[PDB]
Design an enzyme around this catalytic site. Structure first.
Site, PDB file in Angstrom:
ATOM      1  N   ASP A 121       0.843  -1.187   0.000  1.00  0.00           N
ATOM      2  CA  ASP A 121       0.000   0.000   0.000  1.00  0.00           C
ATOM      3  C   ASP A 121       0.881   1.240   0.000  1.00  0.00           C
ATOM      4  O   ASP A 121       1.982   1.225  -0.554  1.00  0.00           O
ATOM      5  CB  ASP A 121      -0.910  -0.009   1.234  1.00  0.00           C
ATOM      6  N   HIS A 179      -3.657   6.166   3.667  1.00  0.00           N
ATOM      7  CA  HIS A 179      -4.421   5.001   3.240  1.00  0.00           C
ATOM      8  C   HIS A 179      -3.846   3.708   3.812  1.00  0.00           C
ATOM      9  O   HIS A 179      -4.578   2.887   4.377  1.00  0.00           O
ATOM     10  CB  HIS A 179      -4.455   4.979   1.711  1.00  0.00           C
ATOM     11  N   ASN A 194     -13.364   0.320  -6.746  1.00  0.00           N
ATOM     12  CA  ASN A 194     -14.451   1.266  -6.463  1.00  0.00           C
ATOM     13  C   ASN A 194     -15.010   1.938  -7.716  1.00  0.00           C
ATOM     14  O   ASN A 194     -15.506   3.067  -7.636  1.00  0.00           O
ATOM     15  CB  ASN A 194     -14.003   2.376  -5.507  1.00  0.00           C
ATOM     16  N   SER A 235     -11.119  -0.822  -0.534  1.00  0.00           N
ATOM     17  CA  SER A 235      -9.864  -0.771   0.218  1.00  0.00           C
ATOM     18  C   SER A 235     -10.070  -1.050   1.703  1.00  0.00           C
ATOM     19  O   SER A 235      -9.148  -1.540   2.365  1.00  0.00           O
ATOM     20  CB  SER A 235      -9.225   0.606   0.087  1.00  0.00           C
TER      21      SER A 235
END
Ligand SMILES: [Ca+2]
Length: 276
Positions: A40, A71, A158, A221
């Site tokens: 990530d 994130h 998404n 996520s």
């Protein structure tokens, strides 16, 4: 042990079959001794919710591994934060492949996956809350990462599109995770289709952030680390097992038929860790 009034509803939801939320998260493993590789933006390892359990181990961008986006810290918190996490004593291992604005390239992501496949400490799981367009090389890399012994959870994406059109969501050996809401609705942004294996809580998920603090954000996520954390509980509870064994356990023990607004052709399955 039972965490009463967990600060994110996602933890609450995955420990029970039906609504209403019990305002409690019960766990009988903490994932101690399992290594969870968060591929990530890096991890803000100093966050208090990690204790001393978070360390960055690789940076594909030539940086120092530290999260400068937030994130990856949020995702790591859902895998394994003391308050925010599914597997509250797991080792969190940061694999930084995305920059301060949350982006990277196919090749930098593969470099991180290659590092994990080569250097992971078993028992190991990996979380990939990221994605892009279909890529044969990225899918192959994901398949070989899973085959190296690392359970692999990846975000469906998404984009309100078919996850078979995206990578690594469409990789055969991924466990690909769609997003649900606190009312058990399919999240409006969630990718769908035959390459999705189950839903997990994704909308309005609260977890750790860069600033030392918290953030509440939405996405597949956020759903994915609930699955990665549950796989870490699995390995600590039963011993190491192959990605296909754990994926089959996840989908067969998932709650069936409770997601509303599901897209026909997508499994109506919601992550359920009760039977651990
Ligand atoms: Ca609950």
């Amino acid at each position: 042990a039972t965490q009463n009034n967990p600060p994110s509803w996602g933890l609450d939801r995955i420990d029970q079959t039906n609504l209403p939320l019990s305002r409690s998260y019960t766990y009988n493993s903490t994932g101690a001794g399992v290594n969870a590789y968060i591929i990530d933006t890096g991890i803000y390892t100093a966050h208090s919710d990690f204790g001393g359990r978070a360390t960055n181990v690789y940076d594909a961008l030539g940086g120092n591994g530290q999260d400068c986006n937030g994130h990856g810290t949020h995702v790591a918190g859902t895998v394994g934060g003391a308050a925010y996490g599914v597997a509250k004593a797991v080792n969190l291992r940061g694999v930084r492949v995305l920059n301060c604005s949350g982006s990277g390239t196919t090749s930098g992501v593969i470099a991180g996956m290659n590092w994990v496949a080569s250097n992971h400490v078993k028992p190991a799981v990996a979380n990939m809350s990221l994605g892009g367009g279909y890529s044969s090389s990225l899918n192959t890399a994901a398949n070989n990462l899973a085959s190296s012994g690392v359970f692999l959870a990846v975000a469906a994406g998404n984009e309100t599109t078919n996850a078979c059109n995206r990578s690594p969501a469409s990789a055969a050996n991924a466990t690909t995770v769609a997003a649900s809401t606190s009312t058990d609705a399919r999240a409006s942004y969630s990718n769908y289709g035959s390459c999705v294996h189950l839903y997990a809580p994704g909308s309005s998920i609260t977890s750790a952030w860069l600033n030392g603090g918290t953030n509440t954000i939405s996405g597949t996520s956020m759903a994915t680390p609930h699955v990665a954390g549950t796989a870490a509980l699995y390995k600590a509870t039963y011993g190491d097992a192959s990605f296909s064994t754990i994926r089959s356990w996840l989908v067969s023990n998932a709650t069936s038929g409770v997601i509303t607004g599901n897209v026909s052709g997508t499994p109506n399955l919601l992550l359920n860790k009760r039977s651990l």
